[PDB]
Design a protein around this nucleic acid. Structure first.
Lengths: 35, 121, 144
RNA sequence: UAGUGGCCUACCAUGGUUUCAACGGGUAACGGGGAAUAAGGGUUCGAUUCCGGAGAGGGAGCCUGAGAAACGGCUACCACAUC
């Protein structure tokens, strides 16, 4: 919680705690060049 | 644009701090450590392509398929780059040049976990 | 009679005559209307320093055949955006954008040395350090 | 008023300036010897050690005094801005 001694959370709209992109395994399906 | 929490002030934050990485985080009144920030999608990582020059009065070459500890800025990563010629490239098409050139500009090619603010590497 | 009055009372005409024909001269009208002050982004100066905006896109007003490593700059005394130039060309490595120059003309207030629109100002001193002792391989020659 | 004076004021007269350029506008305009000049004339500049004018951030206003509409003097407004 971000505060001052106004509360700001670590809200939902975030990239969850990945390092490489988690949509990247599915992005190993854009078969651009099946050479 | 998405800059909300005000810099300039003092702040008391409950930063969640793992028990794994509790070897070398100390209390600097006499020692030396610092802490940085991140972004949303800096949590994600990407593939980088550096521009490198040779260090001055550093004559002896290094083969360029070898792990060099890259800083682009300050922080350290033993990255395994692919240097290619740093000429004026119209079509932005490069080479898998194996090794180095002793004077001109080199363009590394590697995967790094990315700190996106164009530093002197 | 050679199209002019001569008689020794006619000076009333003559200093009103030339008064209306100085405006057909070019630099007279350029000068006495403050056009160098209402225009000419130096503002009657001899140099100006300003941040480099960015790398420059070549628009052919002929001829120097390359991407001329030129710098979009915008000054800080005025803020009026001008395309610029570096001599001893190449070496596109050694300053970022939003970084300093010192500008000076080509010799005609420029207007033509290469295929780049409005490129009329040689850069003299980037960030306070020179270029002539920086093309001399003491220091290093900037980027955009 | 130190004094001439439309400087005011009270009644009068209907004048005055002008294409011989009135009036109005702009000046990156403080005015006079200087400068670059160099056949001569012309040209452009003059903040600047001297003379004269003006101001003490901008306008007012007053005291003391032979002398100031003074600012390392004062009162007020306006713009700032210290403990």
């Amino acid at each position: 919680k971000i505060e001052k001694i106004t509360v700001f959370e670590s809200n939902m709209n975030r990239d969850t705690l990945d390092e490489y992109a988690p949509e990247g395994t599915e992005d190993w399906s854009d078969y651009d060049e099946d050479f | 644009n998405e800059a909300q929490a005000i810099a300039g002030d003092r702040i008391r934050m409950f930063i969640r701090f793992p028990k794994f990485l509790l070897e070398k985080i100390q209390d600097p009144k006499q020692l030396l450590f610092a802490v940085y920030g991140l972004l949303l999608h800096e949590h994600k990582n990407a593939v980088v392509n550096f521009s490198l020059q040779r260090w001055e009065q550093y004559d002896k070459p290094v083969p360029s398929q070898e792990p060099i500890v890259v800083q682009y800025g300050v922080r350290r990563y033993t990255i395994q780059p692919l240097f290619s010629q740093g000429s004026n490239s119209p079509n932005n098409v490069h080479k898998y040049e194996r090794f180095l050139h002793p004077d001109t500009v080199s363009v590394a090619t590697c995967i790094a976990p990315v700190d996106f603010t164009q530093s002197p590497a | 009679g050679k199209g002019k009055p001569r008689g020794l009372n006619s000076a009333r005409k003559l200093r009103v005559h030339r008064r209306n024909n100085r405006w057909a001269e070019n630099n007279y009208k350029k000068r006495l209307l403050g056009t160098a002050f209402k225009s000419s982004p130096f503002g009657g100066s001899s140099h100006a320093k300003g941040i480099v905006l960015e790398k420059l896109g070549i628009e052919s007003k002929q001829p120097n055949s390359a991407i001329r490593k030129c710098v979009r700059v915008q000054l800080i005394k005025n803020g009026k955006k001008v395309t610029a130039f570096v001599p001893n060309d190449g070496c596109l490595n050694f300053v970022d954008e939003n970084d300093e120059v010192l500008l000076a003309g080509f010799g005609r207030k420029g207007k033509a040395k290469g295929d780049i629109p409005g490129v009329r100002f040689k850069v003299v001193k980037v960030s306070g350090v020179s270029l002539l002792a920086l093309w001399k391989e003491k220091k290093e020659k900037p980027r955009s």
